[PDB]
Swiss-Prot record:
Its EC number is 2.7.11.1. This is Interleukin-1 receptor-associated kinase 4. The chain holds residues 165 to 459 of 460 of the full protein. Transmembrane segments: none annotated. The modification Phosphothreonine is found at residue 170. Changing residue 49 to A: Loss of kinase activity. It is an enzyme of class 2 (transferase). Phosphorylated. It comes from the Eukaryota. It catalyses: L-seryl-[protein] + ATP = O-phospho-L-seryl-[protein] + ADP + H(+); L-threonyl-[protein] + ATP = O-phospho-L-threonyl-[protein] + ADP + H(+).
Length: 284
């Protein structure tokens, strides 16, 4: 990866302009651990991350780099470089022109709704990236639709490997609570927890609803699994109304994958290879 001096990056981001790209600045969004800025290096668009002590933020910055060097795939975000300025820490990525799946499902900034067809392809691409990580003995630990980015062709790219671990218990439980498996919430580190998170993501893809909404019933999207199983509601009642091309058969087939992924018992969940196989059969 390219080593940037902090000055190189400050200049390409209009002095790290915290104003949104809609107003004229360079801010595109925010993550865990930093604001993301639009940068331009040699007429190529790049994404820049400017990053709880100084010695603790270093091992979390080194993580994204450690994992991103070992893991390169068509469905993983590509790291282009970094900036080692001691205190100031920056990560540079290939800019995803279509941002996150989260933003594209909510139609943020007026983007049109994703079709069922586009959704199915994104689900498959997201599963392929998780499969590559699991084959390379890595647990993502933060699978969610804000961590699924879309390129120039809406190819799904898993991102954010700051919490990714190699191959177990931990005292420091980290992740996104509305996507987390009961055992991950208990401290277990397992690739099976990632499958569960992916199941929440498949429900987001079918429903177009966020994983958690305080002004909703039920507030957690994974709870709809119980409403359907308890025949209080149907999957037809929950399909995203912002589509014109969804068919009952493939919608039921993706719901069945999500339902299996969301089993409360980690060992009763399918592995990613089975998830990939099942999503492939949905479009065959
Ligand atoms: C209406 N238009 C307006 C433009 C918009 N747009 C394009 C982007 N590009 C984009 N965004 C990223 O992060 C976001 C989603 C939080 C901003 C991002 N993150 C990483 C990454 O891996 N990180 C940091 C860990 C890598 C590449 C990235 N590329 C954002 N918004 C699409 C819709």
């Amino acid at each position: 990866f390219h080593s940037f001096s902090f000055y190189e990056l400050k200049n390409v981001t209009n002095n790290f302009d915290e104003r949104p790209i809609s107003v004229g600045g360079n801010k595109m969004g925010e993550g865990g651990f930093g604001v993301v800025y639009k940068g331009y290096v040699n007429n190529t668009t790049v994404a820049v991350k400017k990053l709880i002590t100084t010695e603790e933020l270093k091992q979390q910055f080194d993580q994204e780099i450690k994992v991103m060097a070992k893991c390169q795939h068509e469905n993983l975000v590509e790291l282009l470089g970094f900036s080692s300025d001691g205190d100031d820490l920056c990560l540079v990525y290939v800019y995803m022109p279509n941002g996150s799946l989260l933003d594209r499902l909510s139609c943020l900034d007026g983007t049109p709704p994703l079709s069922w067809h586009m959704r199915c392809k994104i689900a498959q691409g997201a599963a392929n990236g998780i499969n590559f990580l699991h084959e390379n003995h890595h647990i993502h630990r933060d699978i969610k639709s804000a961590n699924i980015l879309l390129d120039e062709a809406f190819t799904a790219k898993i991102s954010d490997f700051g919490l990714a671990r190699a191959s177990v218990m931990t005292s420091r439980i980290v992740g996104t609570t509305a996507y987390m498996a009961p055992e991950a919430l208990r401290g277990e580190i397992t690739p099976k927890s990632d499958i569960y998170s992916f199941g929440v993501v498949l429900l987001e893809i079918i429903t177009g609803l966020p994983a958690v909404d305080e002004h909703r019933e039920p507030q957690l999207l994974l709870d709809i699994k119980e409403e359907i199983e308890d025949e209080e509601k149907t999957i037809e009642d929950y399909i995203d109304k912002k589509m014109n091309d969804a068919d009952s058969t493939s919608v039921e087939a993706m719901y069945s994958v999500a339902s299996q992924c969301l089993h409360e018992k980690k060992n009763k969940r399918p592995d990613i290879k089975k998830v990939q196989q099942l999503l492939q059969e949905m479009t065959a």
